[PDB]
Design a protein around this motif. Structure first.
Motif, PDB file in Angstrom:
ATOM      1  N   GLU A  39      49.963  14.863 -15.068  1.00  0.00           N
ATOM      2  CA  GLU A  39      51.122  14.855 -15.953  1.00  0.00           C
ATOM      3  C   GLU A  39      51.619  13.433 -16.188  1.00  0.00           C
ATOM      4  N   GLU A  40      52.059  12.782 -15.114  1.00  0.00           N
ATOM      5  CA  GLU A  40      52.686  11.468 -15.221  1.00  0.00           C
ATOM      6  C   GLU A  40      52.057  10.484 -14.239  1.00  0.00           C
ATOM      7  N   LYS A  41      51.858   9.251 -14.692  1.00  0.00           N
ATOM      8  CA  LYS A  41      51.476   8.161 -13.802  1.00  0.00           C
ATOM      9  C   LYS A  41      52.503   7.035 -13.852  1.00  0.00           C
ATOM     10  N   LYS A  42      53.779   7.404 -13.862  1.00  0.00           N
ATOM     11  CA  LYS A  42      54.828   6.519 -14.353  1.00  0.00           C
ATOM     12  C   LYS A  42      55.178   5.458 -13.313  1.00  0.00           C
ATOM     13  N   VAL A  43      55.709   4.332 -13.777  1.00  0.00           N
ATOM     14  CA  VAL A  43      56.042   3.223 -12.892  1.00  0.00           C
ATOM     15  C   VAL A  43      57.553   3.067 -12.752  1.00  0.00           C
ATOM     16  N   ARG A  44      57.971   2.033 -12.031  1.00  0.00           N
ATOM     17  CA  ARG A  44      59.378   1.854 -11.696  1.00  0.00           C
ATOM     18  C   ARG A  44      60.166   1.355 -12.903  1.00  0.00           C
ATOM     19  N   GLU A  45      61.359   1.909 -13.097  1.00  0.00           N
ATOM     20  CA  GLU A  45      62.061   1.786 -14.369  1.00  0.00           C
ATOM     21  C   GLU A  45      62.816   0.463 -14.449  1.00  0.00           C
ATOM     22  N   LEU A  46      63.504   0.248 -15.565  1.00  0.00           N
ATOM     23  CA  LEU A  46      64.066  -1.062 -15.876  1.00  0.00           C
ATOM     24  C   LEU A  46      65.575  -0.970 -16.090  1.00  0.00           C
ATOM     25  N   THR A  47      66.314  -0.818 -14.995  1.00  0.00           N
ATOM     26  CA  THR A  47      67.769  -0.762 -15.057  1.00  0.00           C
ATOM     27  C   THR A  47      68.378  -2.151 -14.904  1.00  0.00           C
ATOM     28  N   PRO A  48      69.598  -2.325 -15.434  1.00  0.00           N
ATOM     29  CA  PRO A  48      70.351  -3.574 -15.295  1.00  0.00           C
ATOM     30  C   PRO A  48      70.701  -3.881 -13.842  1.00  0.00           C
ATOM     31  N   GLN A  49      70.610  -2.865 -12.989  1.00  0.00           N
ATOM     32  CA  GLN A  49      70.909  -3.030 -11.572  1.00  0.00           C
ATOM     33  C   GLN A  49      69.680  -3.511 -10.808  1.00  0.00           C
ATOM     34  N   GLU A  50      68.540  -2.882 -11.074  1.00  0.00           N
ATOM     35  CA  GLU A  50      67.309  -3.196 -10.359  1.00  0.00           C
ATOM     36  C   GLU A  50      66.750  -4.543 -10.806  1.00  0.00           C
ATOM     37  N   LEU A  51      66.852  -4.820 -12.101  1.00  0.00           N
ATOM     38  CA  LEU A  51      66.198  -5.984 -12.690  1.00  0.00           C
ATOM     39  C   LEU A  51      66.818  -7.278 -12.171  1.00  0.00           C
ATOM     40  N   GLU A  52      68.068  -7.190 -11.724  1.00  0.00           N
ATOM     41  CA  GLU A  52      68.797  -8.367 -11.266  1.00  0.00           C
ATOM     42  C   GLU A  52      68.092  -9.017 -10.079  1.00  0.00           C
ATOM     43  N   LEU A  53      67.412  -8.199  -9.283  1.00  0.00           N
ATOM     44  CA  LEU A  53      66.728  -8.687  -8.088  1.00  0.00           C
ATOM     45  C   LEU A  53      65.617  -9.664  -8.460  1.00  0.00           C
ATOM     46  N   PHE A  54      65.028  -9.464  -9.634  1.00  0.00           N
ATOM     47  CA  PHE A  54      63.948 -10.323 -10.105  1.00  0.00           C
ATOM     48  C   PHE A  54      64.456 -11.738 -10.371  1.00  0.00           C
ATOM     49  N   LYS A  55      65.427 -11.851 -11.272  1.00  0.00           N
ATOM     50  CA  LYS A  55      66.003 -13.145 -11.617  1.00  0.00           C
ATOM     51  C   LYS A  55      66.715 -13.761 -10.416  1.00  0.00           C
ATOM     52  N   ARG A  56      67.170 -12.910  -9.505  1.00  0.00           N
ATOM     53  CA  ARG A  56      67.739 -13.372  -8.243  1.00  0.00           C
ATOM     54  C   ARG A  56      66.693 -14.110  -7.413  1.00  0.00           C
ATOM     55  N   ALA A  57      65.520 -13.504  -7.274  1.00  0.00           N
ATOM     56  CA  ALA A  57      64.470 -14.056  -6.428  1.00  0.00           C
ATOM     57  C   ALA A  57      63.904 -15.340  -7.022  1.00  0.00           C
ATOM     58  N   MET A  58      63.874 -15.411  -8.350  1.00  0.00           N
ATOM     59  CA  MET A  58      63.340 -16.578  -9.041  1.00  0.00           C
ATOM     60  C   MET A  58      64.331 -17.737  -8.996  1.00  0.00           C
ATOM     61  N   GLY A  59      65.582 -17.427  -8.671  1.00  0.00           N
ATOM     62  CA  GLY A  59      66.614 -18.448  -8.633  1.00  0.00           C
ATOM     63  C   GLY A  59      66.971 -18.965 -10.013  1.00  0.00           C
ATOM     64  N   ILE A  60      66.956 -18.073 -10.998  1.00  0.00           N
ATOM     65  CA  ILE A  60      67.109 -18.472 -12.391  1.00  0.00           C
ATOM     66  C   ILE A  60      68.539 -18.917 -12.680  1.00  0.00           C
ATOM     67  N   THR A  61      68.677 -20.091 -13.288  1.00  0.00           N
ATOM     68  CA  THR A  61      69.988 -20.685 -13.513  1.00  0.00           C
ATOM     69  C   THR A  61      70.478 -20.412 -14.931  1.00  0.00           C
ATOM     70  N   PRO A  62      71.799 -20.530 -15.133  1.00  0.00           N
ATOM     71  CA  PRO A  62      72.416 -20.363 -16.453  1.00  0.00           C
ATOM     72  C   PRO A  62      71.886 -21.367 -17.472  1.00  0.00           C
ATOM     73  N   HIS A  63      71.285 -22.445 -16.976  1.00  0.00           N
ATOM     74  CA  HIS A  63      70.661 -23.438 -17.842  1.00  0.00           C
ATOM     75  C   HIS A  63      69.384 -22.886 -18.470  1.00  0.00           C
ATOM     76  N   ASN A  64      68.509 -22.334 -17.634  1.00  0.00           N
ATOM     77  CA  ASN A  64      67.249 -21.775 -18.107  1.00  0.00           C
ATOM     78  C   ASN A  64      67.290 -20.249 -18.091  1.00  0.00           C
ATOM     79  N   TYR A  65      68.497 -19.696 -18.097  1.00  0.00           N
ATOM     80  CA  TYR A  65      68.673 -18.249 -18.087  1.00  0.00           C
ATOM     81  C   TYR A  65      68.099 -17.621 -19.354  1.00  0.00           C
ATOM     82  N   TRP A  66      68.547 -18.113 -20.504  1.00  0.00           N
ATOM     83  CA  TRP A  66      68.049 -17.630 -21.787  1.00  0.00           C
ATOM     84  C   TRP A  66      66.560 -17.923 -21.939  1.00  0.00           C
ATOM     85  N   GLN A  67      66.110 -19.008 -21.320  1.00  0.00           N
ATOM     86  CA  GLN A  67      64.704 -19.390 -21.373  1.00  0.00           C
ATOM     87  C   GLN A  67      63.833 -18.362 -20.656  1.00  0.00           C
TER      88      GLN A  67
END
Length: 86
Positions: free
Chosen positions: A6-34
């Motif tokens: 039926e489904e082989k689905k992957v992990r979804e893309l919430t505004p809550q979960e996704l924050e951990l990604f940019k958190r780990a990368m240490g993304i700054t407001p300077h290169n945030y939009w980048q």
């Protein structure tokens, strides 16, 4: 109902979960939009494995620089995140 067919689905893309990604990368407001550009609104799919940006799974396995890179490993994510941890 096809709990195995039926489904082989992957992990979804919430505004809550996704924050951990940019958190780990240490993304700054300077290169945030980048990063927000390269990451397609920080929309990256995965399932306990290497992570990729939605829409760029067609651009996986190619010889691309960091600027054109559209996928990272959980190990790399933790690599930077562990550096962020003090």
């Amino acid at each position: 109902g096809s709990e195995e067919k039926e489904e082989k689905k992957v992990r979804e893309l919430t505004p809550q979960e996704l924050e951990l990604f940019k958190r780990a990368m240490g993304i700054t407001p300077h290169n945030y939009w980048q990063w927000a550009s390269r990451t397609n609104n920080f929309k990256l799919l995965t399932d306990g494995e290497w992570v990729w940006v939605e829409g760029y799974e067609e651009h996986i396995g190619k010889q691309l620089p960091l600027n054109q890179a559209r996928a990272w490993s959980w190990e790399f994510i933790k690599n930077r995140l562990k550096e962020l941890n003090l």
